[PDB]
């Protein structure tokens, strides 16, 4: 039983570099191997490199080779992953995976680190209402950067029948998202519906009352 | 470099059934150096099977791997409600260490047609200079569906983005939203805004539309 903790998520401009740390603590086995696997949104799993910190041996993937260096500070059992010369394609969640015991049968993972590689910089969202057609209504969280955002309804009082859809990437380089909710038709001109949009990264919380217009 | 392919793409079953998952390799794999992993939406992967056919410690009875060389299998004898997720075969024979595109295990349910809804762009957004028309496809099954945008019966493609939810736990269905985005100027140049939906739960296509104003 070990505890893999990865570094906070970050956003870098194209061309620059990123360094992702991965702290380990516990597990007697001091002969462990570290693997770095990334996953671009919607796509499959992609291996990048593996290090055996103790021995000092490290392999890399054909694809990246040159752009990626995996180091390890043996004292604090913290693994590292440096990817330089960044492009848009490199936007992904990155995982460190520790493997223990003879065959490497012991599976341990970090929580993941989100790296967003884009030109356009941190911006707040604009919440636009999708006026009601049981009837359906919702919000449109448009033009924000970076991910993620969190949408709730009536501070969490309405959580039944709500659909928050995965964001999409507009050509502008900003994200657009829509939330919807199936509500009773009869409750329309009587019950209040407000979506609360929280965007931690840009430091912006916006609430918006949705009503027929 | 070795390439891995899995079959089928998605797999649709119910709790208590047998699942059979494949992994066609394009080359030989060191006697049997292939792994299987589990992944739930927005979570770190999870090693299940190493060396083609050896359960990792903790992994329940029902799981088992088979075959070697260039052809591999993963098999869950009786599906538990927790066994519905993406599965990835991975070879650790020759570098670069490669993964498969994955197989989704989803709950099979009876076919359900989508409730189609269309939202014209808000007053507030039209001030800012761009118009976003949202088409919502609600609680439908299976996931396969088409959306065709029409503007005065000139079919559209390129100027819309779409996004599907993960399978609902409550009713085993999916939901898809599509956003047709174009400028204030372009939106005013036209009259009819239609949304044609072709899901297999429909006898023929459905069209939901509105006239601007």
Q: A105–B50: do the CB atoms touch at under 8 Å? A: yes
Half-sphere exposure of A48 (CA within 13 A, CB side): 24
Per the omega criterion (within 30 degrees of 0), is the bond before A151 cis? no
List, in order, residues 6 or more apart from A168 with CB less than 8 Å away.
A175, A176, A177, B161, B162, B163, B179
Question: B31, B96, B175: best mutation site toward chain A, by most A Cβ within 10 Å?
Answer: B96
Do the beta carbons of residue A121 and residue A173 sit within 8 Å? no
Give the B window 46-75 contacts with A, CB below 8 Å. 46-47, 50-51, 54, 56-57
- Ramachandran region of residue B93, left (φ > 0), alpha (ψ -120 to 50) or beta? alpha
From A67, A100, A119, give the residue that closes a domain: A119
Neighbours of B186 (CB within 10 A): 13
Q: Tell if the CB–CB gap between B125 and A142 is shorter than 8 Å.
A: yes
**CA angle, corner A112, sides to A110 and A115, nearest 5?**
145
Among the candidates A119, A149, A168, a domain finishes at: A119
List CB contacts (< 8 A) between A45 and chain B.
37, 39, 45, 88, 90, 99, 102
CA distance linking residue A137 with residue A180, whole number of Å: 6
Among residues A102, A119, A136, the one where a domain terminates is A119
Note whether A57 and A158 are same-domain residues.
no
Residue A160's nearest CA partner among B125, B147, B169 is: B169
Domains in chain B: boundaries: 1-109, 110-212
Q: Which residues of B137-164 are buried (b: 16+ CB within 10 A; e: fewer)?
A: bbbbbbbebebbbbbeeeeeeeebbbbb
The answer to whether residues B3 and B29 touch, using CB atoms and an 8 Å cutoff, is no
**Closest among A99, A100, A74, A71 to A83, alpha carbons compared:** A71
- Experimental technique: X-ray
Please list the residues that pair with A212 across neighbouring strands.
none
Residues of B in contact with A133 (CB under 8 A): 117
Residues of A whose CB is below 8 A from B37: 45
Q: Strand B10-13 to strand B19-25: parallel, antiparallel, or no bridges (unpaired)?
A: unpaired
Does A134 share its domain with A75? no
> Exposure pattern of A6-30 as b/e (b: 16+ CB <10 Å)?
bbebebbeeeeebebbbbbeebeee
**How does strand B10-13 pair with strand B103-107?**
parallel
Instruction: Give the CATH fold of the B110-212 domain.
Output: Immunoglobulin-like (2.60.40)
Annotate chain B with three-state secondary structure: CCCEECCCCEEEECCCCCEEEEEEECCCCCCCCEEEEEECCCCCCEEEEECCCEECCCCCCCEEEECCCCEEEEEECCCCCCCCCEEEEEECCCCCCEECCCEEEEECCCCECCEEEEECCCHHHHHHCEEEEEEEEEEEECCCEEEEEEECCEEECCCEEEEECCCCCCCCCEEEEEEEEEEHHHHHCCCEEEEEEEECCCCCCEEEEEECC
Nearest CB neighbour to A44, from listed B1, B101, B163: B101
- Examine the domain organization and report whether A41 and A28 are in the same domain: yes
Tokens encoding B153: 């019966």
Can you give A108-149 as a three-state secondary structure string?
EECCCEEEEECCCCCECCEEEEECCCCEEEEEEEEEEECCCC
Which residues have a C–N gap over 2.5 Å right after them in chain B?
none
Nearest to B141 by CA among B108, B98, B186, B116: B108
Which value in Å is the resolution of this experimental model?
Answer: 3.3
Q: In terms of domains, do A76 and A90 share one? A: yes
Query: Do residue A114 and residue A149 come from a single domain?
Result: no
DSSP-derived secondary structure letter, A170: -
Q: From the list A109, A128, A180, which residue is nearest B122 (CB)?
A: A128
The answer to whether A114 touches A39, Cβ cutoff 8 Å, is no
Cβ contact A77:A110 at 8 Å: no
Question: How big is the A-B interface in CB pairs under 8 Å?
Answer: 121
Alpha-carbon distance A62 to B97, whole Å?
Answer: 9
Give the neighbor-by-neighbor strand order of the sheet with B115-119. Answer: B115-119, B130-140, B174-183, B160-164
* A75 and A32 part of one domain: yes
Window 169-188 of B, Cβ < 8 Å to A: 175-177, 179, 181
> What residues in B contact A142, CB-CB < 8 Å?
125, 132
Helix (H, G, I), strand (E, B) or coil at A155: helix
Yes or no: say if B119 and A142 are a contact pair by the CB < 8 Å rule.
no
Specify the CATH number for the domain of residue A86. Answer: 2.60.40.10
Nearest residue to A55 via CA among A35, A89, A31: A31
Asked if the bond preceding B8 is cis, omega within 30° of 0, the reply is yes
With a CB cutoff of 8 Å and minimum separation 6, the contacts of B169 are: none
Bridge partners of A206, per DSSP, are: A197
Are residues A126 and A186 located together in one domain of the fold? yes
Q: Clarify whether residues A111 and A130 are in a common domain.
A: no
Question: CA A28 → CA A162, A202, B189, distances in Å?
Answer: 46, 42, 70
Closest by CA position to A153, among listed A193, A189, A199, A183: A193
Q: State the DSSP code for A179.
A: E
* A113, A125: one domain: no
Q: In terms of Cα–Cα distance, which of A124, A125, A134, A135 is closest to A210?
A: A135
Note every long-range contact of A159-164, with CB atoms under 8 Å and residues 24 or more positions apart, other chains counting: A163/A138, A163/B138, A163/B165, A163/B175, A163/B177
A155 and A212 in a single domain? The answer is yes
Q: Which helix (H) or strand (E) holds A69?
A: strand A68-69
For chain A, the domain total comes to 2
- Candidates B44, B97, B98, B176: best to mutate against A (most CBs of A within 10 A) is B44
- Take residue A183 and report the two structure tokens written for it: 């509500």
Q: Are B44 and B97 in contact (CB under 8 A)?
A: no
B148's tokens: 């065709």
Interchain pair A103, B115: CB under 8 A: no
Domain assignment of residue A171, given as a range: 120-213
Please state, as a whole number, how many other Cβ atoms lie within 10 Å of the Cβ of residue B207. Answer: 13
Distance CA A86, CA A74 (A): 27
Place of tokens 């204030």: B184
Q: How many CA atoms lie within 13 A of A174 on its CB side?
A: 15
Answer yes or no: same fold for B1-109 and B110-212: yes
Question: B1-109 adopts what CATH topology?
Answer: Immunoglobulin-like (2.60.40)
Interface of A with B (CB under 8 A): 35, 37, 44-47, 50, 59-63, 95, 97, 103-107, 109-112, 126, 128-131, 133, 136, 138, 140, 142, 163, 165-168, 170, 176, 178, 180, 182, 213
Phi, psi of A90 (to 5 degrees): -85, -5
d(C-alpha A157, C-alpha A155), whole Å? 6
Residues from chain A contacting residue B136 (CB–CB below 8 Å): 136, 138, 180
**Cβ A180 vs Cβ B177: under 8 Å:** yes
């Amino acid at each position: 039983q070990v505890q893999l903790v990865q570094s906070g998520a970050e956003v870098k401009k194209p061309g620059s570099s990123v360094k992702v740390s991965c702290k380990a603590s516990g597990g007697t086995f001091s002969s462990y191997a570290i693997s770095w696997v990334r996953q671009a949104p919607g796509q499959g799993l992609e291996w990048m490199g593996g290090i055996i910190p103790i021995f000092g041996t490290a392999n890399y993937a054909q694809k990246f080779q040159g752009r990626v260096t995996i180091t390890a500070d043996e004292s604090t059992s913290t693994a590292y992953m440096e990817l330089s010369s960044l492009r848009s394609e490199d936007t992904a969640v990155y995982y460190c995976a520790r493997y223990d015991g003879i065959y490497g049968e012991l599976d341990f993972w970090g929580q993941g680190t989100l790296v967003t590689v884009s030109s356009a910089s941190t911006k707040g969202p604009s919440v636009f209402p999708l006026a009601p057609s049981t009837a359906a209504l919702g919000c449109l969280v448009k033009d924000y950067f970076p991910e993620p955002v969190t949408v709730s309804w009536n501070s969490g009082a309405l959580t039944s029948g709500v659909h928050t859809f995965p964001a999409v990437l507009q050509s502008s380089g900003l994200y657009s998202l829509s939330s919807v909710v199936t509500v009773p038709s009869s409750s329309l001109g009587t019950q209040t519906y407000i979506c609360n949009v929280n965007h931690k990264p840009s430091n912006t919380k916006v609430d918006k009352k949705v009503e027929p217009k | 470099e070795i390439v891995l392919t899995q079959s089928p793409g998605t797999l649709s079953l119910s709790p208590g059934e047998r699942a059979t998952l494949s992994c066609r390799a394009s080359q030989s794999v060191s006697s049997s150096y292939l792994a299987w992993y589990q992944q739930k939406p927005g979570q770190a992967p999870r090693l299940l099977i190493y060396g083609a056919s050896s359960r990792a410690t903790g992994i329940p009875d029902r799981f088992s791997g088979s075959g070697s060389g260039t052809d591999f299998t993963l098999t869950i004898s009786r599906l538990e409600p927790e066994d519905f997720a993406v599965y990835y075969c991975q070879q650790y024979g020759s570098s670069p260490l490669t993964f498969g595109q994955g197989t989704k295990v989803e709950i099979k349910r009876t076919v359900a047609a989508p409730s189609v809804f269309i939202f014209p762009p808000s007053d507030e957004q039209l001030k800012s200079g761009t118009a976003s028309v949202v088409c919502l496809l609600n609680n439908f099954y299976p996931r396969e569906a088409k959306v065709q945008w029409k503007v005065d019966n000139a079919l559209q493609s390129g100027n819309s983005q779409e996004s599907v939810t993960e399978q609902d736990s409550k009713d085993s269905t999916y939901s898809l939203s599509s956003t047709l985005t174009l400028s204030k100027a372009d939106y005013e140049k036209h009259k009819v805004y239609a949304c044609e939906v072709t899901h297999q739960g429909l006898s023929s296509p459905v069209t939901k539309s509105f006239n601007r104003g």
